[PDB]
Structure formats: C-alpha cells, structure tokens
Short mmCIF file of N, CA and C (backbone and C1' of nucleotides) in Angstrom, two decimals:
data_model
loop_
_atom_site.label_atom_id
_atom_site.label_comp_id
_atom_site.label_asym_id
_atom_site.label_seq_id
_atom_site.Cartn_x
_atom_site.Cartn_y
_atom_site.Cartn_z
N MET A 1 0.84 -1.23 0.00
CA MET A 1 0.00 0.00 0.00
C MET A 1 0.86 1.26 0.00
N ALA A 2 1.73 1.38 1.00
CA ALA A 2 2.62 2.53 1.13
C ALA A 2 1.86 3.74 1.67
N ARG A 3 2.57 4.85 1.85
CA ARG A 3 1.95 6.07 2.35
C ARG A 3 0.70 6.42 1.57
N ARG A 4 0.85 7.09 0.42
CA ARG A 4 -0.30 7.48 -0.38
C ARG A 4 0.09 8.13 -1.70
N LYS A 5 -0.91 8.34 -2.56
CA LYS A 5 -0.70 8.98 -3.86
C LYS A 5 -2.02 9.14 -4.60
N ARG A 6 -2.77 8.05 -4.68
CA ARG A 6 -4.05 8.02 -5.38
C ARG A 6 -4.86 6.81 -4.91
N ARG A 7 -4.85 5.73 -5.71
CA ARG A 7 -5.55 4.47 -5.40
C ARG A 7 -7.01 4.66 -4.96
N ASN A 8 -7.24 5.56 -4.02
CA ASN A 8 -8.57 5.82 -3.50
C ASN A 8 -9.56 6.16 -4.62
N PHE A 9 -9.84 7.45 -4.85
CA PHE A 9 -10.78 7.86 -5.88
C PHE A 9 -10.39 7.33 -7.25
N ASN A 10 -11.05 6.27 -7.65
CA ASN A 10 -10.80 5.66 -8.95
C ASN A 10 -11.27 6.58 -10.08
N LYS A 11 -11.03 6.16 -11.32
CA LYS A 11 -11.42 6.96 -12.48
C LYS A 11 -12.91 7.29 -12.47
N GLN A 12 -13.70 6.53 -11.72
CA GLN A 12 -15.14 6.76 -11.65
C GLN A 12 -15.44 7.98 -10.78
N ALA A 13 -14.83 8.03 -9.61
CA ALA A 13 -15.05 9.14 -8.68
C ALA A 13 -14.58 10.47 -9.26
N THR A 14 -13.42 10.45 -9.91
CA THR A 14 -12.86 11.66 -10.50
C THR A 14 -13.84 12.31 -11.48
N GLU A 15 -14.30 11.54 -12.46
CA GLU A 15 -15.24 12.06 -13.45
C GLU A 15 -16.47 12.66 -12.78
N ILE A 16 -16.95 11.98 -11.74
CA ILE A 16 -18.14 12.40 -11.01
C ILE A 16 -17.90 13.63 -10.13
N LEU A 17 -16.91 13.54 -9.25
CA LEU A 17 -16.63 14.63 -8.32
C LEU A 17 -16.29 15.94 -9.04
N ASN A 18 -15.47 15.89 -10.10
CA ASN A 18 -15.10 17.11 -10.82
C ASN A 18 -16.33 17.81 -11.39
N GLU A 19 -17.13 17.07 -12.15
CA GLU A 19 -18.34 17.63 -12.77
C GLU A 19 -19.15 18.44 -11.77
N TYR A 20 -19.30 17.91 -10.56
CA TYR A 20 -20.05 18.60 -9.52
C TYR A 20 -19.21 19.73 -8.92
N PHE A 21 -17.92 19.48 -8.77
CA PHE A 21 -16.99 20.49 -8.24
C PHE A 21 -17.11 21.80 -9.01
N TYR A 22 -17.09 21.73 -10.33
CA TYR A 22 -17.18 22.92 -11.18
C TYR A 22 -18.52 23.65 -11.02
N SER A 23 -19.31 23.28 -10.02
CA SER A 23 -20.59 23.94 -9.77
C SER A 23 -20.55 24.68 -8.44
N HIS A 24 -19.66 24.25 -7.55
CA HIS A 24 -19.51 24.88 -6.24
C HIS A 24 -18.09 25.39 -6.03
N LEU A 25 -17.46 25.86 -7.11
CA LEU A 25 -16.10 26.41 -7.01
C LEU A 25 -15.99 27.36 -5.82
N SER A 26 -16.85 28.38 -5.81
CA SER A 26 -16.84 29.38 -4.73
C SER A 26 -17.07 28.72 -3.37
N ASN A 27 -17.38 27.43 -3.38
CA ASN A 27 -17.60 26.66 -2.16
C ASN A 27 -17.03 25.26 -2.36
N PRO A 28 -15.69 25.14 -2.32
CA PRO A 28 -14.98 23.86 -2.53
C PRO A 28 -15.27 22.79 -1.49
N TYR A 29 -16.55 22.57 -1.21
CA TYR A 29 -16.96 21.56 -0.25
C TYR A 29 -18.37 21.07 -0.55
N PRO A 30 -18.55 19.75 -0.77
CA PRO A 30 -19.86 19.15 -1.07
C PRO A 30 -20.93 19.56 -0.04
N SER A 31 -21.90 18.69 0.18
CA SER A 31 -22.96 18.90 1.15
C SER A 31 -23.30 17.54 1.72
N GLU A 32 -24.08 17.47 2.78
CA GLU A 32 -24.42 16.17 3.36
C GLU A 32 -24.93 15.22 2.29
N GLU A 33 -25.92 15.65 1.52
CA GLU A 33 -26.46 14.82 0.47
C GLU A 33 -25.47 14.68 -0.68
N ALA A 34 -24.64 15.70 -0.88
CA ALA A 34 -23.64 15.67 -1.94
C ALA A 34 -22.61 14.59 -1.67
N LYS A 35 -21.96 14.64 -0.50
CA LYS A 35 -20.98 13.62 -0.16
C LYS A 35 -21.63 12.24 -0.17
N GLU A 36 -22.94 12.21 0.01
CA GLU A 36 -23.69 10.97 -0.02
C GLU A 36 -23.85 10.49 -1.46
N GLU A 37 -24.50 11.31 -2.28
CA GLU A 37 -24.70 10.97 -3.68
C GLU A 37 -23.35 10.75 -4.36
N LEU A 38 -22.43 11.69 -4.17
CA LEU A 38 -21.10 11.60 -4.75
C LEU A 38 -20.44 10.28 -4.37
N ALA A 39 -20.25 10.09 -3.07
CA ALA A 39 -19.61 8.89 -2.55
C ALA A 39 -20.31 7.61 -3.03
N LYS A 40 -21.62 7.70 -3.26
CA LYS A 40 -22.38 6.55 -3.73
C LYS A 40 -22.11 6.34 -5.20
N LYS A 41 -22.17 7.45 -5.92
CA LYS A 41 -21.95 7.49 -7.35
C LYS A 41 -20.50 7.16 -7.70
N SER A 42 -19.58 7.78 -6.99
CA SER A 42 -18.16 7.59 -7.20
C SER A 42 -17.67 6.24 -6.69
N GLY A 43 -17.98 5.95 -5.44
CA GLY A 43 -17.54 4.71 -4.83
C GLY A 43 -16.59 4.97 -3.68
N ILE A 44 -16.64 6.20 -3.17
CA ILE A 44 -15.81 6.63 -2.06
C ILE A 44 -16.67 6.78 -0.81
N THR A 45 -16.15 7.48 0.19
CA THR A 45 -16.90 7.72 1.41
C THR A 45 -17.03 9.22 1.60
N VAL A 46 -18.17 9.65 2.11
CA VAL A 46 -18.44 11.07 2.34
C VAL A 46 -17.15 11.87 2.58
N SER A 47 -16.57 11.70 3.76
CA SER A 47 -15.34 12.41 4.14
C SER A 47 -14.28 12.44 3.03
N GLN A 48 -14.21 11.41 2.19
CA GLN A 48 -13.23 11.41 1.11
C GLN A 48 -13.56 12.49 0.09
N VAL A 49 -14.84 12.68 -0.17
CA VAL A 49 -15.28 13.70 -1.11
C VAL A 49 -14.75 15.07 -0.71
N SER A 50 -15.03 15.48 0.52
CA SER A 50 -14.55 16.77 1.02
C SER A 50 -13.03 16.87 0.90
N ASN A 51 -12.39 15.70 0.94
CA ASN A 51 -10.94 15.62 0.79
C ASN A 51 -10.56 15.88 -0.66
N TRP A 52 -11.20 15.13 -1.55
CA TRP A 52 -10.97 15.25 -2.99
C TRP A 52 -11.23 16.68 -3.47
N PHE A 53 -12.44 17.16 -3.20
CA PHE A 53 -12.86 18.50 -3.61
C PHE A 53 -11.81 19.55 -3.25
N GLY A 54 -11.45 19.62 -1.98
CA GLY A 54 -10.47 20.60 -1.53
C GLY A 54 -9.23 20.65 -2.42
N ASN A 55 -8.78 19.49 -2.88
CA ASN A 55 -7.59 19.41 -3.73
C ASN A 55 -7.86 19.95 -5.13
N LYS A 56 -9.09 19.79 -5.62
CA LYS A 56 -9.44 20.26 -6.95
C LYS A 56 -9.25 21.76 -7.10
N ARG A 57 -9.70 22.53 -6.11
CA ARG A 57 -9.55 23.98 -6.16
C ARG A 57 -8.07 24.33 -6.21
N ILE A 58 -7.28 23.67 -5.37
CA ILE A 58 -5.86 23.94 -5.31
C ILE A 58 -5.26 23.76 -6.69
N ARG A 59 -5.34 22.55 -7.23
CA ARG A 59 -4.81 22.26 -8.56
C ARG A 59 -5.32 23.31 -9.57
N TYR A 60 -6.53 23.81 -9.34
CA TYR A 60 -7.12 24.83 -10.22
C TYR A 60 -6.20 26.05 -10.31
N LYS A 61 -5.96 26.67 -9.16
CA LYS A 61 -5.09 27.85 -9.04
C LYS A 61 -3.76 27.71 -9.79
N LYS A 62 -3.40 26.49 -10.13
CA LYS A 62 -2.14 26.23 -10.83
C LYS A 62 -2.27 26.50 -12.32
N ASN A 63 -3.41 26.14 -12.90
CA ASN A 63 -3.62 26.32 -14.33
C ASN A 63 -4.99 26.90 -14.66
N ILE A 64 -5.42 27.89 -13.87
CA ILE A 64 -6.71 28.57 -14.05
C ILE A 64 -7.40 28.32 -15.41
N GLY A 65 -6.84 28.90 -16.47
CA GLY A 65 -7.41 28.77 -17.81
C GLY A 65 -7.67 27.34 -18.24
N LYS A 66 -6.95 26.41 -17.63
CA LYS A 66 -7.11 25.00 -17.94
C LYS A 66 -8.40 24.48 -17.33
N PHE A 67 -8.70 24.95 -16.13
CA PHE A 67 -9.90 24.55 -15.41
C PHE A 67 -11.13 25.29 -15.90
N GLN A 68 -10.94 26.51 -16.39
CA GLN A 68 -12.05 27.29 -16.91
C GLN A 68 -12.76 26.52 -18.01
N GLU A 69 -12.05 26.31 -19.12
CA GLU A 69 -12.61 25.57 -20.25
C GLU A 69 -13.18 24.23 -19.79
N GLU A 70 -12.46 23.55 -18.91
CA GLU A 70 -12.92 22.28 -18.37
C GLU A 70 -14.24 22.49 -17.67
N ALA A 71 -14.25 23.47 -16.78
CA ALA A 71 -15.45 23.82 -16.03
C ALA A 71 -16.67 23.83 -16.94
N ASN A 72 -16.50 24.37 -18.15
CA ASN A 72 -17.60 24.42 -19.11
C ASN A 72 -17.85 23.04 -19.70
N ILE A 73 -16.77 22.29 -19.91
CA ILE A 73 -16.85 20.95 -20.47
C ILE A 73 -17.64 20.03 -19.54
N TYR A 74 -17.14 19.87 -18.33
CA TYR A 74 -17.76 19.02 -17.33
C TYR A 74 -19.12 19.57 -16.89
N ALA A 75 -19.25 20.89 -16.89
CA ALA A 75 -20.49 21.53 -16.49
C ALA A 75 -21.68 21.05 -17.33
N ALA A 76 -21.56 21.20 -18.64
CA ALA A 76 -22.63 20.79 -19.56
C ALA A 76 -23.05 19.34 -19.33
N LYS A 77 -22.15 18.53 -18.80
CA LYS A 77 -22.44 17.12 -18.55
C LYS A 77 -22.82 16.87 -17.09
N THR A 78 -23.60 17.78 -16.51
CA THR A 78 -24.03 17.63 -15.13
C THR A 78 -25.36 16.87 -15.04
N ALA A 79 -26.09 16.82 -16.15
CA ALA A 79 -27.37 16.13 -16.19
C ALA A 79 -27.19 14.62 -16.36
N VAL A 80 -25.94 14.16 -16.37
CA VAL A 80 -25.66 12.73 -16.53
C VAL A 80 -25.75 12.00 -15.20
N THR A 81 -26.49 10.89 -15.20
CA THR A 81 -26.67 10.08 -13.99
C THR A 81 -27.17 10.92 -12.83
N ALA A 82 -28.49 10.91 -12.63
CA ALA A 82 -29.10 11.68 -11.55
C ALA A 82 -28.82 13.17 -11.70
"O5'" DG B 1 18.31 -0.43 -15.17
"C5'" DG B 1 17.80 0.31 -16.29
"C4'" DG B 1 17.55 1.75 -15.92
"C3'" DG B 1 18.00 2.14 -14.51
"O3'" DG B 1 18.65 3.41 -14.54
"C1'" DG B 1 15.62 1.77 -14.66
P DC B 2 18.82 4.25 -13.18
"O5'" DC B 2 17.48 5.11 -13.09
"C5'" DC B 2 16.74 5.44 -14.27
"C4'" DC B 2 16.19 6.84 -14.16
"C3'" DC B 2 16.21 7.44 -12.76
"O3'" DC B 2 16.37 8.87 -12.85
"C1'" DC B 2 13.99 6.73 -13.38
P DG B 3 15.16 9.85 -12.46
"O5'" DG B 3 13.94 9.32 -13.34
"C5'" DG B 3 14.00 9.36 -14.77
"C4'" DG B 3 12.65 9.71 -15.33
"C3'" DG B 3 12.12 11.08 -14.91
"O3'" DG B 3 11.33 11.64 -15.96
"C1'" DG B 3 10.67 9.41 -14.10
P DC B 4 10.80 13.16 -15.84
"O5'" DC B 4 9.31 13.09 -16.38
"C5'" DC B 4 8.98 12.31 -17.53
"C4'" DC B 4 7.52 11.91 -17.49
"C3'" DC B 4 6.56 13.04 -17.12
"O3'" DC B 4 5.31 12.88 -17.81
"C1'" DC B 4 6.43 11.34 -15.49
P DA B 5 4.08 13.85 -17.47
"O5'" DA B 5 3.04 12.90 -16.72
"C5'" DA B 5 1.94 12.32 -17.42
"C4'" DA B 5 0.87 11.88 -16.45
"C3'" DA B 5 0.13 13.02 -15.75
"O3'" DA B 5 -1.25 12.70 -15.59
"C1'" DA B 5 1.19 11.67 -14.13
P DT B 6 -2.17 13.56 -14.59
"O5'" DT B 6 -2.14 12.73 -13.23
"C5'" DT B 6 -2.89 11.52 -13.10
"C4'" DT B 6 -3.31 11.33 -11.66
"C3'" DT B 6 -4.01 12.53 -11.02
"O3'" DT B 6 -4.93 12.09 -10.01
"C1'" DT B 6 -2.01 12.14 -9.88
P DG B 7 -6.30 12.89 -9.77
"O5'" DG B 7 -6.40 13.02 -8.19
"C5'" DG B 7 -6.88 11.94 -7.39
"C4'" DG B 7 -5.93 11.67 -6.25
"C3'" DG B 7 -6.18 12.49 -4.99
"O3'" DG B 7 -6.99 11.73 -4.08
"C1'" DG B 7 -3.81 12.37 -5.55
P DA B 8 -6.73 11.82 -2.50
"O5'" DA B 8 -5.20 11.39 -2.33
"C5'" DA B 8 -4.84 10.01 -2.26
"C4'" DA B 8 -3.86 9.79 -1.13
"C3'" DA B 8 -4.40 10.11 0.26
"O3'" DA B 8 -3.70 9.33 1.25
"C1'" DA B 8 -2.81 11.75 -0.39
P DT B 9 -3.71 9.79 2.80
"O5'" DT B 9 -2.29 10.47 3.03
"C5'" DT B 9 -1.22 9.74 3.64
"C4'" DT B 9 -0.14 10.69 4.14
"C3'" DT B 9 -0.41 11.30 5.51
"O3'" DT B 9 0.82 11.64 6.17
"C1'" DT B 9 -0.35 13.01 3.96
P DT B 10 0.81 12.64 7.43
"O5'" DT B 10 0.64 14.10 6.79
"C5'" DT B 10 1.70 14.70 6.04
"C4'" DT B 10 2.17 15.97 6.72
"C3'" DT B 10 1.71 16.16 8.16
"O3'" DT B 10 2.69 16.90 8.89
"C1'" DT B 10 0.53 17.65 6.67
P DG B 11 2.30 17.56 10.31
"O5'" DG B 11 2.21 19.12 9.98
"C5'" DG B 11 3.09 19.71 9.02
"C4'" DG B 11 2.62 21.09 8.66
"C3'" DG B 11 2.10 21.93 9.83
"O3'" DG B 11 2.67 23.24 9.77
"C1'" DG B 11 0.45 21.81 8.11
P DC B 12 2.05 24.43 10.65
"O5'" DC B 12 1.38 25.38 9.56
"C5'" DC B 12 1.84 25.38 8.21
"C4'" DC B 12 1.24 26.54 7.45
"C3'" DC B 12 1.02 27.80 8.27
"O3'" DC B 12 1.09 28.97 7.45
"C1'" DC B 12 -1.08 26.82 7.70
P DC B 13 0.40 29.00 6.00
"O5'" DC B 13 -1.16 28.99 6.31
"C5'" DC B 13 -2.06 29.81 5.55
"C4'" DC B 13 -2.51 30.99 6.38
"C3'" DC B 13 -1.80 31.14 7.72
"O3'" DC B 13 -0.70 32.05 7.60
"C1'" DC B 13 -4.14 31.03 8.07
P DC B 14 -0.68 33.41 8.45
"O5'" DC B 14 -2.04 34.14 8.04
"C5'" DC B 14 -2.02 35.41 7.38
"C4'" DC B 14 -3.31 35.63 6.64
"C3'" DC B 14 -4.08 36.89 7.05
"O3'" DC B 14 -4.75 37.46 5.92
"C1'" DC B 14 -5.40 34.98 7.52
"O5'" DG C 1 -12.79 22.80 15.97
"C5'" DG C 1 -13.93 23.67 15.99
"C4'" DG C 1 -14.62 23.68 14.65
"C3'" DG C 1 -14.20 22.56 13.70
"O3'" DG C 1 -15.29 22.22 12.83
"C1'" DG C 1 -13.48 24.64 12.82
P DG C 2 -15.00 21.34 11.51
"O5'" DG C 2 -14.86 22.42 10.35
"C5'" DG C 2 -15.83 23.46 10.20
"C4'" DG C 2 -15.57 24.22 8.92
"C3'" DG C 2 -15.51 23.37 7.66
"O3'" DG C 2 -15.95 24.12 6.52
"C1'" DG C 2 -13.37 24.30 8.07
P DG C 3 -15.89 23.45 5.06
"O5'" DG C 3 -14.61 24.13 4.38
"C5'" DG C 3 -14.32 25.51 4.59
"C4'" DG C 3 -13.20 25.95 3.68
"C3'" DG C 3 -12.94 25.05 2.47
"O3'" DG C 3 -12.61 25.86 1.34
"C1'" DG C 3 -11.03 25.06 3.88
P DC C 4 -11.20 25.68 0.59
"O5'" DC C 4 -10.12 26.11 1.68
"C5'" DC C 4 -9.82 27.49 1.90
"C4'" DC C 4 -8.38 27.77 1.54
"C3'" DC C 4 -8.02 27.52 0.08
"O3'" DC C 4 -6.97 28.42 -0.31
"C1'" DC C 4 -6.91 25.94 1.43
P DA C 5 -5.64 27.86 -1.02
"O5'" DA C 5 -4.93 26.99 0.12
"C5'" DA C 5 -4.11 27.61 1.11
"C4'" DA C 5 -2.72 27.01 1.08
"C3'" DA C 5 -2.12 26.88 -0.32
"O3'" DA C 5 -0.70 27.07 -0.27
"C1'" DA C 5 -2.35 24.73 0.62
P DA C 6 0.11 27.37 -1.62
"O5'" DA C 6 0.56 25.93 -2.12
"C5'" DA C 6 1.88 25.72 -2.64
"C4'" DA C 6 2.75 25.07 -1.58
"C3'" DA C 6 3.85 24.18 -2.13
"O3'" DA C 6 4.89 24.05 -1.16
"C1'" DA C 6 2.33 22.84 -1.02
P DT C 7 5.89 22.79 -1.20
"O5'" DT C 7 5.00 21.56 -0.68
"C5'" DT C 7 5.34 20.87 0.53
"C4'" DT C 7 6.32 19.75 0.25
"C3'" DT C 7 7.33 20.08 -0.84
"O3'" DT C 7 8.54 19.32 -0.63
"C1'" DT C 7 5.65 18.58 -1.67
P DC C 8 8.71 17.85 -1.27
"O5'" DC C 8 7.94 16.89 -0.26
"C5'" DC C 8 8.54 15.68 0.21
"C4'" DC C 8 7.70 14.49 -0.22
"C3'" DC C 8 8.34 13.59 -1.28
"O3'" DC C 8 9.03 12.52 -0.63
"C1'" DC C 8 6.01 14.04 -1.76
P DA C 9 9.57 11.28 -1.50
"O5'" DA C 9 8.55 10.10 -1.14
"C5'" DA C 9 7.78 10.15 0.06
"C4'" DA C 9 6.49 9.38 -0.13
"C3'" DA C 9 6.67 7.95 -0.65
"O3'" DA C 9 5.62 7.11 -0.19
"C1'" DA C 9 5.53 9.22 -2.27
P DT C 10 5.70 5.53 -0.45
"O5'" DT C 10 4.41 5.20 -1.34
"C5'" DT C 10 3.23 5.99 -1.22
"C4'" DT C 10 2.32 5.74 -2.40
"C3'" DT C 10 2.61 4.45 -3.16
"O3'" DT C 10 1.39 3.85 -3.63
"C1'" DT C 10 2.78 6.25 -4.62
P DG C 11 1.44 2.40 -4.34
"O5'" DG C 11 0.73 2.62 -5.75
"C5'" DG C 11 0.42 3.94 -6.22
"C4'" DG C 11 -0.18 3.88 -7.60
"C3'" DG C 11 -0.01 2.56 -8.34
"O3'" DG C 11 -1.01 2.49 -9.38
"C1'" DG C 11 1.47 4.17 -9.23
P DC C 12 -0.60 1.99 -10.86
"O5'" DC C 12 0.44 3.08 -11.39
"C5'" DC C 12 0.03 4.17 -12.23
"C4'" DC C 12 0.11 3.78 -13.69
"C3'" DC C 12 -0.15 2.30 -13.96
"O3'" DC C 12 -0.75 2.12 -15.25
"C1'" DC C 12 2.20 2.86 -13.99
P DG C 13 0.16 1.87 -16.55
"O5'" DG C 13 1.28 2.99 -16.45
"C5'" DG C 13 0.96 4.36 -16.72
"C4'" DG C 13 2.15 5.05 -17.35
"C3'" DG C 13 2.44 4.63 -18.79
"O3'" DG C 13 2.73 5.79 -19.58
"C1'" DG C 13 4.36 4.33 -17.46
P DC C 14 3.22 5.63 -21.10
"O5'" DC C 14 4.64 6.36 -21.12
"C5'" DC C 14 4.85 7.55 -20.35
"C4'" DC C 14 6.33 7.75 -20.10
"C3'" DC C 14 7.20 7.72 -21.35
"O3'" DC C 14 8.26 8.67 -21.25
"C1'" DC C 14 7.89 6.00 -19.89
#
DNA sequence: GCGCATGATTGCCC
DNA sequence: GGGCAATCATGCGC
C-alpha cells in the first residue's frame, strides 16, 4: 500500500466529483447529500469527497485557464446520472 | 531503470 | 473549525 498517492478515488469518482466540483467552485466543499450521492456514485466515502474537492480547487489555481474551459466541459455534462 | 502523471499526507491562516 | 495549501511518495508508465 505505502503512504499514499491516489488508489482511492478511482477513475469513476474523478469524473463524477469534478463535474459537480465545477458547480460549487466558490464553495470547494460538497454537502451532506452531496458527499452521499457523490460517494455513492463515485464509490468513495463522504469524508473522502470533502478531501478530494479541496484538492481540486488547489490544482485549479495552478492552471486557471485549464480549469475554466474544463469547467464548461464538465459543467454541460451535469445532467448525466441523476 | 527513473521518471512522469495524480492524488494523499501535513500543516497553515489569515 | 473548516477550507486551502504545497511537496512528496505512490502508481504505472515512460
């Protein structure tokens, strides 16, 4: 296993969490039902979501314009699965 | 054969 | 307290 790096949020959680993340940027933290739906949808646990999300904003500040266009990309696909 | 891609561990933060 | 914030090992691939 080792210390850490990824392993947790699989490719499923990432696609899911980001899409929703780009909706609460100004609030880089899910909600009770959010961490529930997310964690259910993704395959993680509530607390992990708040963990994942927090990191998304950070990485954002690194390549702003990269996340902007993405934000629109993933945004339009928010009506997918629930 | 070492490193390049990605989040997790850790601490700060005004 | 919650959220934000680098820095690194971990993975997987180059």
